[PDB]
């Protein structure tokens, strides 16, 4: 059981911003409950498999993409080039949204909502859920920061170790080569002396 | 000693010939360290003795190096990271023509 | 413009949860605005440096201790064992909070709030701020997770690279020794040949 909260603007009242909360169990196919709030009044509705299936069948579209479009629209997943316009008539309590592409409207879905007699409870639940999410995110961020610090320390130690190794290899190589050049110089001096003696 | 005669200059400094502009490159720094450990000569200052130049995934500095090499008596070669990795893996030098 | 949101259980109405929003400019000492809401109506009030100083003088204590107590009480900074009781008289709009330790109590603070003409606006602002905080925290967590994954991959590769370098370091010295041996022996063979020629 999870849910998503988004900000929704209405054409009737563009200045005022409403809140849309969509709650589902495991996946949008089974169903979902949508709550619309304005801070003073609340509306609630539910969509089960039958209604979504009938709406998809009527629209003559593959059911595999209707769920995707609904998710993109109602979960604030619209892209930069995608614009969705919502309209909620209070007199009949009828909600419906369309997609504005290429300067032509296109209906997606229509729902009938029912007023909630206790708007306070839904607002309180929304605020409590938001606070719980904030706390969980803060704890996760703290743990992740600790892990990042540990990883950075490990990386610095590894870099220092590699520097040590390169320095040691260079020192060993230079020492050995110095010894060898000294010995070879002595041998060449002996060769030159022997050649000079043989010249006689 | 397979890189004894191949001195390599890395683009790990934002400003050339400036020791105060050290970057925090992750792959570049250790790659330069490995090159030095493997016998190559790394110089922090770009002088006339440089022979090869290595530039990371930052392509913004390619123009600067291409302009600098024009004034230099000898022109160095710009190579990518696959060259060094392949050379180490195969234990033998790879042709720069495939990695220019 | 720091802000903090907390949840409280008023003794007058223990069946519902109230939300306390404390907003201050730089530090709690300078002053803060406190808003108490329950989902339908909100009461706002202001506390200035003068009121805080007067209360501290009444307590006859330094500003630091009173500020710490206020932070622990209002900002949900309570420790493992710290009990606070909040009371809100609605008729006169008087909100006072006290610290309970056994039967003895202490009226830590007492302010006067005023009803807001627009209750929906403050609730909308609170929800919007909570959603923005959630989004920012999620973005930061995603960025840190990506950075940690990159660091882990780099460290994993570097460990093996360093191990291979260390392994080759050991064979370097034996290679160099076997290398010097042959050339030194060749020079000694040259000496032998020269001496054999000189034997005449």
UniProtKB/Swiss-Prot annotation, chains A, C:
Main site of residence?
nucleus
Coiled-coil regions listed in the entry? 131-165
Outcome when changing residue 106 to E: Abolished interaction with NHEJ1/XLF
Please report which protein family the annotation says this sequence is part of: Belongs to the XRCC4-XLF family. XRCC4 subfamily.
Protein's UniProt name: DNA repair protein XRCC4
Q: Where is the protein localized?
A: Nucleus; Chromosome
Q: In which tissues is it expressed?
A: Widely expressed.
- Is Transmembrane helix there in the keyword field? no
Q: Which residues carry this modification: Phosphoserine?
A: 53, 193
Alphabetized, the UniProt keywords read: Chromosome, Coiled coil, Cytoplasm, Disease variant, DNA damage, DNA recombination, DNA repair, DNA-binding, Dwarfism, Isopeptide bond, Nucleus, Phosphoprotein, Ubl conjugation
* Outcome recorded upon mutating residue 161 to Q: In SSMED; no expression of the protein is observed; complete loss of function in DNA double-strand break repair
Its cellular-component GO annotations read: cytosol; DNA ligase IV complex; DNA-dependent protein kinase-DNA ligase 4 complex; nonhomologous end joining complex; nucleoplasm; nucleus; site of double-strand break
Q: Give the consequence of mutating residue 26 to E.
A: Abolished interaction with NHEJ1/XLF
Q: What post-translational modification information does the record give?
A: Phosphorylations by PRKDC at the C-terminus of XRCC4 and NHEJ1/XLF are highly redundant and regulate ability of the XRCC4-NHEJ1/XLF subcomplex to bridge DNA. Phosphorylation by PRKDC does not prevent interaction with NHEJ1/XLF but disrupts ability to bridge DNA and promotes detachment from DNA.
Q: Which residues of the full protein are shown?
A: 1 to 200 of 336
Q: Write one Gene Ontology MF term.
A: DNA binding
UniProtKB/Swiss-Prot annotation, chain B:
Q: Where in the cell is it found?
A: Nucleus
- UniProt domain BRCT: residue ranges: 1-100
- Source species, domain of life: Eukaryota
Question: Tissue specificity, please?
Answer: Testis, thymus, prostate and heart.
- Subunit-structure text: Interacts with XRCC4; the LIG4-XRCC4 subcomplex has a 1:2 stoichiometry and XRCC4 is required for LIG4 stability. Component of the core long-range non-homologous end joining (NHEJ) complex (also named DNA-PK complex) composed of PRKDC, LIG4, XRCC4, XRCC6/Ku70, XRCC5/Ku86 and NHEJ1/XLF. Additional component of the NHEJ complex includes PAXX. Following autophosphorylation, PRKDC dissociates from DNA, leading to formation of the short-range NHEJ complex, composed of LIG4, XRCC4, XRCC6/Ku70, XRCC5/Ku86 and NHEJ1/XLF. Interacts with DCLRE1C; the interaction is direct. Interacts with APLF.
Record: disease: LIG4 syndrome: Characterized by immunodeficiency and developmental and growth delay. Patients display unusual facial features, microcephaly, growth and/or developmental delay, pancytopenia, and various skin abnormalities.
Function, in words = DNA ligase involved in DNA non-homologous end joining (NHEJ); required for double-strand break (DSB) repair and V(D)J recombination. Catalyzes the NHEJ ligation step of the broken DNA during DSB repair by resealing the DNA breaks after the gap filling is completed. Joins single-strand breaks in a double-stranded polydeoxynucleotide in an ATP-dependent reaction. LIG4 is mechanistically flexible: it can ligate nicks as well as compatible DNA overhangs alone, while in the presence of XRCC4, it can ligate ends with 2-nucleotides (nt) microhomology and 1-nt gaps.
**According to its UniProt record, which protein family does this protein belong to?**
Belongs to the ATP-dependent DNA ligase family.
- What is the protein name given in its UniProt record? DNA ligase 4
């Amino acid at each position: 059981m999870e849910r998503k909260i988004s900000r929704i603007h209405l054409v009737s009242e563009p200045s005022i911003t409403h809140f849309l909360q969509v709650s589902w169990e495991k996946t949008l196919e089974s169903g979902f409950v949508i709550t619309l709030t304005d801070g003073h009044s609340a509306w609630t509705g539910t969509v089960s498999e039958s209604e979504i299936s009938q709406e998809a069948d009527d629209m003559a579209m593959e059911k595999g993409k209707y769920v995707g479009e609904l998710r993109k629209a109602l979960l604030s997943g619209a892209g930069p080039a995608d614009v969705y316009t919502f309209n909620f008539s209070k007199e009949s309590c009828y909600f419906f949204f369309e997609k504005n592409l290429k300067d032509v409207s296109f209906r997606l879905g229509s729902f009938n909502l029912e007023k909630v007699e206790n708007p306070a409870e839904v607002i309180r639940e929304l605020i409590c859920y938001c606070l719980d999410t904030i706390a969980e995110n803060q704890a996760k961020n703290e743990h992740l920061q600790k892990e990042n610090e540990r990883l950075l320390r490990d990386w610095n130690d590894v870099q220092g170790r590699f520097e040590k190794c390169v320095s040691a290899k260079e020192a060993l190589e230079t020492d050995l080569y110095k010894r060898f050049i000294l010995v070879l110089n002595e041998k060449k001096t002996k060769i030159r002396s022997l050649h000079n003696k043989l010249l006689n | 000693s397979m890189f004894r005669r191949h001195t390599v200059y890395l683009d790990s400094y934002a400003v050339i010939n400036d020791l105060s502009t050290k970057n925090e490159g992750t792959r570049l720094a250790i790659k330069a360290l490995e090159l030095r450990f493997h016998g190559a000569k790394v110089v922090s200052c770009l002088a006339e003795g440089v022979s090869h130049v290595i530039i990371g995934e930052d392509h913004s500095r390619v123009a600067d190096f291409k302009a600098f090499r024009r004034t230099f008596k000898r022109k160095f070669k710009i190579l990518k990271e696959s060259w060094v990795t392949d050379s180490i893996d195969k234990c033998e030098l790879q042709e720069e023509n495939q990695y220019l």
